[PDB]
Amino acid sequence: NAEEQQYLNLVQYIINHGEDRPDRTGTGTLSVFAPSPLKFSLRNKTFPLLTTKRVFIRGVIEELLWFIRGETDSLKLREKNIHIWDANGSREYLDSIGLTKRQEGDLGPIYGFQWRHFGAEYIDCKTNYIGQGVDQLANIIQKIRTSPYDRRLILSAWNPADLEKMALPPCHMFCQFYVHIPSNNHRPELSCQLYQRSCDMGLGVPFNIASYALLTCMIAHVCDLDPGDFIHVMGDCHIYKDHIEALQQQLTRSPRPFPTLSLNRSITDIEDFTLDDFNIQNYHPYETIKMKMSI
Amino acid sequence: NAEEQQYLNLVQYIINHGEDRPDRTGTGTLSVFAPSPLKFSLRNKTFPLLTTKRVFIRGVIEELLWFIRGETDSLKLREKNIHIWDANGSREYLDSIGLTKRQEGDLGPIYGFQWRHFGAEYIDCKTNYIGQGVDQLANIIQKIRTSPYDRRLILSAWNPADLEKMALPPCHMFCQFYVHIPSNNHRPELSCQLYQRSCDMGLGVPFNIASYALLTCMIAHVCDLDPGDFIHVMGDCHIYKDHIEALQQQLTRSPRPFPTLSLNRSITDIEDFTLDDFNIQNYHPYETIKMKMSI
Ligand SMILES: Cc1nc2ccc3ccc(CNc4ccc5c(c4)CN([C@@H](CCC(=O)O)C(=O)O)C5=O)cc3c2c(=O)[nH]1
Numbered sequence: 388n389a390e391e392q393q394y395l396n397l398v399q400y401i402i403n404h405g406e407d408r409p410d411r412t413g414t415g416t417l418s419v420f421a422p423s424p425l426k427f428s429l430r431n432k433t434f435p436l437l438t439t440k441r442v443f444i445r446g447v448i449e450e451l452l453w454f455i456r457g458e459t460d461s462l463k464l465r466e467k468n469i470h471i472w473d474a475n476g477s478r479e480y481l482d483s484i485g486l487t488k489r490q491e492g493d494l495g496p497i498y499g500f501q502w503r504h505f506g507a508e509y510i511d512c513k514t515n516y517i518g519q520g521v522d523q524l525a526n527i528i529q530k531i532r533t534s535p536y537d538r539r540l541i542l543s544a545w546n547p548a549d550l551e552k553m554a555l556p557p558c559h560m561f562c563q564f565y566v567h568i569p570s571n572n573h574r575p576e577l578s579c580q581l582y583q584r585s586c587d588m589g590l591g592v593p594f595n596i597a598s599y600a601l602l603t604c605m606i607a608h609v610c611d612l613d614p615g616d617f618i619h620v621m622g623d624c625h626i627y628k629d630h631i632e633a634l635q636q637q638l639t640r641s642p643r644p645f646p647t648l649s650l651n652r653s654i655t656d657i658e659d660f661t662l663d664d665f666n667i668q669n670y671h672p673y674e675t676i677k678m679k680m681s682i
Numbered sequence: 683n684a685e686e687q688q689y690l691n692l693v694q695y696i697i698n699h700g701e702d703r704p705d706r707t708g709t710g711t712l713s714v715f716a717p718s719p720l721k722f723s724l725r726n727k728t729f730p731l732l733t734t735k736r737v738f739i740r741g742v743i744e745e746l747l748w749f750i751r752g753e754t755d756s757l758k759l760r761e762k763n764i765h766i767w768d769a770n771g772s773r774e775y776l777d778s779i780g781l782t783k784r785q786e787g788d789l790g791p792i793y794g795f796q797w798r799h800f801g802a803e804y805i806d807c808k809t810n811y812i813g814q815g816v817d818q819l820a821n822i823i824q825k826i827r828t829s830p831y832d833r834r835l836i837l838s839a840w841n842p843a844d845l846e847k848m849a850l851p852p853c854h855m856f857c858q859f860y861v862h863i864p865s866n867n868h869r870p871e872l873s874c875q876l877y878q879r880s881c882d883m884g885l886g887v888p889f890n891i892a893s894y895a896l897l898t899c900m901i902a903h904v905c906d907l908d909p910g911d912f913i914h915v916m917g918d919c920h921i922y923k924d925h926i927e928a929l930q931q932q933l934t935r936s937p938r939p940f941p942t943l944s945l946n947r948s949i950t951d952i953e954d955f956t957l958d959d960f961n962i963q964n965y966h967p968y969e970t971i972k973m974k975m976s977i
């Protein structure tokens with residue numbers, strides 16, 4: 388409600404004050420740099436899925452599960468009717484950035500590969516990288532359980548050495564987790580601060596918010612913690628000019644309270660979650676608003 | 683002033699509401715996660731060098747220049763009578779973290795090495811790394827002069843694959859630059875958003891604020907831009923206990939206006955700056971306050 392209003396207020400702010408700038412995708416964008424971070428409480432099982440707009444949660448979970456497996460083949464998502472990566476993985480796109488010998492769908496060493504094998508030599512999206520590079524995610528879980536107050540709980544996909552091999556350099560670049568000391572005598576809280584260098588407010592941001600709120604909830608669950616807060620920090624925060632009209636109608640809408648999230652099945656290893664382990668109760672959004680990706 | 687007040691209000695807030703938590707150094711700390719970012723305007727040549735406590739700006743400049751040369755030998759700083767890195771480079775500390783074969787002073791592939799040679803194989807602090815790895819800094823300067831509105835102007839020292847080799851993992855992890863469109867008809871401004879995963883509010887933060895304001899001014903200067911804003915985002919923001927004493931009073935001192943900075947001699951290349959090229963004027967801080975480091 389008020390939390391969702393933050394997002395809506397940022398959208399209105401960019402519409403009314405964003406700088407008009409030239410985009411690589413030819414389309415126009417209104418943009419603001421370093422706006423105040425968005426904050427979402429994950430307490431009481433609350434889950435930050437926007438209500439003023441239908442948010443396809445299934446694809447969010449599938450993408451996260453795919454990242455966790457260290458996968459980089461977009462066909463794995465396409466096989467499940469998730470097409471967000473089809474454009475950046477297309478033969479045409481790949482050739483436009485000089486990746487003429489990359490099979491279609493092989494996005495390169497993006498999120499998943501960096502999260503699980505940072506530093507490993509990338510070959511293709513069919514190779515088994517077990518044991519290569521550093522498994523940041525496993526390391527984070529292990530540290531949380533061993534020295535939860537550690538100040539190095541970083542999960543990062545930003546690898547300068549691999550950028551030229553990626554179909555798209557990471558937008559959600561890195562996040563930091565923090566375990567809070569027990570309030571009163573409750574279960575410790577796990578918070579997450581995400582830094583996103585480039586944020587497509589109309590299309591991407593709602594999914595990214597959900598994505599990290601889920602990840603935080605998953606790692607909290609597997610570590611016997613309760614989820615605390617999700618903090619979304621943004622660099623170039625923008626709106627594609629062909630989304631304005633639609634956002635302005637979304638802006639006339641009133642936020643309903645967020646749904647809740649229950650992690651069922653009692654999963655105990657981050658790698659064990661599956662689509663059906665996620666229980667989102669009481670999600671009642673307004674209709675869906677069509678917002679086309681600008682590739 | 684009001685800008686310096688942000689810092690002061692944060693110090694006091696941590697003193698009063700910060701979580702008490704065990705530290706690796708053994709000392710205790712008061713800490714808060716993801717407090718509101720501090721923002722500093724670099725317009726009108728304003729340089730955010732704290733006045734409520736004399737900041738060793740010569741040490742700030744020399745460390746920055748050392749970072750830019752891609753240096754990792756703390757002795758280079760020691761020769762100039764700058765000692766902040768001596769402890770982390772000592773035989774004792776080095777061995778304490780398992781670097782028993784590392785020569786004293788050889789910090790490993792930290793900041794400067796990552797900035798100019800990300801991904802290169804680190805050997806020691808006396809090896810010539812020219813041409814190895816990714817020169818993020820040169821790439822940023824070239825992108826600004828080529829396609830300023832690029833959303834990928836990132837400078838990062840966070841390299842999971844090299845963390846174990848570092849005497850200390852990066853505190854100021856990465857920053858993102860943003861070139862604003864011209865306002866009215868004045869020269870475009872360059873802004874910088876820094877993400878610091880762990881901030882020693884008492885000792886480090888004032889130096890880091892100064893350090894990144896300087897870098898921003900330097901890149902802008904060589905790219906024919908004017909400086910815009912410096913935004914400091916923080917993860918685990920803390921105060922060391924053995925520092926609270928010397929900080930509660932600093933909170934009694936009223937902030938004077940910040941000095942100004944002029945970069946002269948017409949340096950036109952980022953690797954050409956030297957100490958005398960920095961002209962900090964009207965810097966008049968209160969007495970210097972002794973604050974011990976926690977190895
Ligand atoms: C310009 C631009 N390009 C992108 C390229 C790749 C992306 C990959 C992931 C995400 C964020 N994550 C998800 C995860 C799942 C879905 C969606 C986004 C969008 N989505 C659409 C349909 C996808 C389609 O447009 O092809 C829907 O309305 O539900 C999902 O199923 C955003 C982008 C952007 C993006 O936001 N903007």
Ligand SMILES: Cc1nc2ccc3ccc(CNc4ccc5c(c4)CN([C@@H](CCC(=O)O)C(=O)O)C5=O)cc3c2c(=O)[nH]1
Binds near residue numbers: 738882887890977
């Ligand atoms: C616990 C802790 N450890 C650190 C380890 C390495 C660091 C490297 C750089 C900076 C930030 N940059 C500078 C750059 C120059 C100076 C100082 C800090 C501190 N300083 C001291 C003298 C050096 C000393 O402490 O030995 C002074 O009070 O003038 C300077 O000359 C902070 C740390 C911290 C830090 O702030 N805290």
Ligand SMILES: *c1cc(=O)[nH]c(=O)n1[C@H]1C[C@H](O)[C@@H](COP(=O)(O)O)O1
Binds near residue numbers: 538851853881890
């Ligand atoms: C690290 C280096 C710097 O430039 N600035 C800082 O404030 N610090 C501080 C943070 C922390 O107190 C200590 C590093 O400890 P850790 O790696 O976070 O565990 O130095």
Ligand SMILES: O=c1ccn([C@H]2C[C@H](O)[C@@H](COP(=O)(O)O)O2)c(=O)[nH]1
Binds near residue numbers: 556558585590833834
């Ligand atoms: O999870 C994601 C991935 C991408 N983007 C958007 C941001 C940009 O509009 C475009 C990436 O383009 P560059 O910033 O790299 O140009 O995709 C997001 O918002 N979220």
